Amino acid sequence: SCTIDHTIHQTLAPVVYVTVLVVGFPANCLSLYFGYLQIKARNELGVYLCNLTVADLFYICSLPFWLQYVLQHDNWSHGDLSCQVCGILLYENIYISVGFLCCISVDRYLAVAHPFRFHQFRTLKAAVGVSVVIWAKELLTSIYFLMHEEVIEDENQHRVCFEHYPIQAWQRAINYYRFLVGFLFPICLLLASYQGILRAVRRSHGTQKSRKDQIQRLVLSTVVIFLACFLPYHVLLLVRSVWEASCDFAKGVFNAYHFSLLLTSFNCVADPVLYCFVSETTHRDL
């Protein structure tokens, strides 16, 4: 019983959604082709790049339904399902991407800091196994989110998709576990791997002065863009979940939470650029 206004939800959303779709479909297709090229020539990263690109495409394919939801005034026309599907691909499909980012970070760390050891952990079979485990986590979370019937009507008859304003009791625990597992473990792993890589490259001898300053720029760029994409969403998520429940409070930070959610969609554009384009190998096949 708290019609929240959503002027912003209907103003900045379409531009972002259309720009993301247009920029990120061909980019991800080309990244998939590059991943094929890598996986052909016995490289362990190719599995991770291909899986990350597939996850990005799965996210991207869900925007058109959300785009039609935004175009229309508060209405969700297609069916009584696919809101429990596109909801998954919009809210809980952003973590397969972070899982594969952490996999790439650990692979790089074991490749550049301990090059003489752990030969059996950098083979194709291990990559397939870990990929299957991550996708099985996706499938178990996906068999979750369906025991709960999540569509409600508005005072002015509309259909909201995957959000309940006075946060429900069953969603607070999901928010807490989501924050911890998805943004305190992956960030620590990323930082603790990239510090090791930077130390190893600065202790080297054969790399000229120029290239160590380059690798540094790439690593800091990757970490910073990841933080700018994800951190505000999780901070506002905690802010809402812990001590921001009363309906008046709820009406207050609707902007903040949806702006953070809108911003977290740039991963699909950032990932192919930072992992498939800024590389001499990618420039040698174009």
UniProtKB/Swiss-Prot annotation:
Tissues where this protein is expressed: Found at low level in a wide range of tissues, but significantly expressed in lung, kidney, bone and nervous system.
GO cellular component: plasma membrane
Cytoplasmic side: 39-42, 115-122, 204-207
Ranges facing Extracellular side: 74-78, 150-165, 244-249
Record site feature (Proton sensing), residues: 6, 9, 73, 158, 258
Result after altering residue 164 to F: No effect on pH-sensing activity
GO molecular function: G protein-coupled receptor activity
Effect noted on mutating residue 116 to A: Abolished proton-induced G-protein coupled receptor signaling
Domains: entry comment: A multitude of proton-sensing residues, which include extracellular histidine residues (His-6, His-9, His-73, His-158 and His-258) or triad of buried acidic residues (Asp-56, Glu-138 and Asp-271), contribute to activation of the G-protein coupled receptor activity and pH sensitivity.
Record-stated family: Belongs to the G-protein coupled receptor 1 family.
Disease implication from the record: Amelogenesis imperfecta, hypomaturation type, 2A6: A defect of enamel formation. The disorder involves both primary and secondary dentitions. The teeth have a shiny agar jelly appearance and the enamel is softer than normal. Brown pigment is present in middle layers of enamel.
Name the UniProt record assigns to this protein: G-protein coupled receptor 68
Lineage: Eukaryota, Metazoa, Chordata, Craniata, Vertebrata
Gene: GPR68
